[PDB]
Ligand binder design. Structure first.
Ligand SMILES: NC(=O)C1=CN([C@@H]2O[C@H](COP(=O)(O)OP(=O)(O)OC[C@H]3O[C@@H](n4cnc5c(N)ncnc54)[C@H](OP(=O)(O)O)[C@@H]3O)[C@@H](O)[C@H]2O)C=CC1
Ligand SMILES: *COc1cc(Cc2cnc(N)nc2N)cc(C#CCCCC(=O)O)c1OC
Length: 206
């Protein structure tokens, strides 16, 4: 037991695959963030009684999150890092790799545990995203496409939306996105801060 569940990656990126700047999001989209929270937090009502989703993130992304919103509530947080000095926390798990993170979660939350894991999300860090893209359990990408070539210093590691990856990565219908997300999601381009963006869901066969 260490690779039964599939991994889902969630990211906001420009048409040029840009995802970040000075260790932060180069855009202020309150609605986008609302989507991110909704998607990574959603659990089927029936399972909602004792099931929570997991959010795996890199150390940089973790530090980039305002203490006020740290850690991400209603979700089990796990920070992937190799440097362990005096990183404080409130029970926040710590793993040195994506697989080390999965073994930690499956061990901490077994069929005997009170809290059961529902979905596992990889929410951040180009580095962690790079490792997820290579993981055989990653089969889904919740992408928020930003139609603007905003200046970025960090980019998504793989052009999953490009022609070269079109036989591996396919974009699902909006009805399937909502069906998987469990809720109604805005369809079409959304305008916030003079920028057009929309939600998409991409999948690959494991
Ligand atoms: N547009 C979007 O949706 C998002 C954008 N971002 C942005 O991404 C940028 C930061 O990117 P990046 O620097 O890559 O961030 P990461 O959060 O991936 O930082 C990498 C750190 O995390 C650890 N790490 C990551 N992958 C691994 C691995 N496979 N094994 C071990 N440790 C690993 C290491 O920790 P240590 O050094 O402690 O060992 C490494 O230094 C910022 O602009 C940020 O805002 C972040 C999330 C979402
Ligand atoms: C430090 O930048 C950053 C990144 C994220 C991760 C994110 C955002 N959007 C999409 N589509 N995918 C990912 N992985 C999230 C935030 C934020 C926030 C705050 C509070 C929210 C909550 O979920 O409870 C972020 O901070 C500016």
């Amino acid at each position: 037991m260490n690779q039964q569940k599939s991994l889902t990656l969630i990211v906001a990126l420009t048409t040029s695959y840009g995802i970040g700047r000075s260790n932060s999001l180069p855009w202020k989209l309150k609605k986008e963030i609302s989507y991110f929270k909704r998607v990574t937090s959603f659990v089927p009502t029936f399972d909602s009684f004792e099931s929570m989703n997991v959010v795996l993130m890199g150390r940089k992304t973790w530090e980039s999150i305002p203490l006020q919103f740290r850690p991400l509530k209603g979700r089990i947080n796990v920070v992937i890092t190799r440097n362990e000095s005096l990183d404080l926390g409130n029970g926040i798990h710590s793993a040195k790799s994506l697989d080390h993170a999965l073994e930690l979660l499956y061990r901490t939350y077994g069929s005997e545990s009170s809290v059961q894991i529902n979905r596992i999300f990889v929410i951040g860090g180009a580095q962690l995203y790079k490792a997820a893209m290579d993981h055989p359990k990653l089969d889904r990408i919740m992408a928020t496409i930003i139609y603007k070539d905003i200046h970025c210093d960090v980019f998504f590691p793989l052009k999953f939306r490009d022609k070269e990856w079109s036989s591996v990565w396919k974009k699902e219908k909006h009805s399937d996105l909502e069906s998987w997300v469990g809720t109604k999601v805005p369809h079409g381009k959304i305008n916030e801060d003079g920028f057009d963006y929309e939600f998409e869901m991409w999948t690959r066969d494991l």
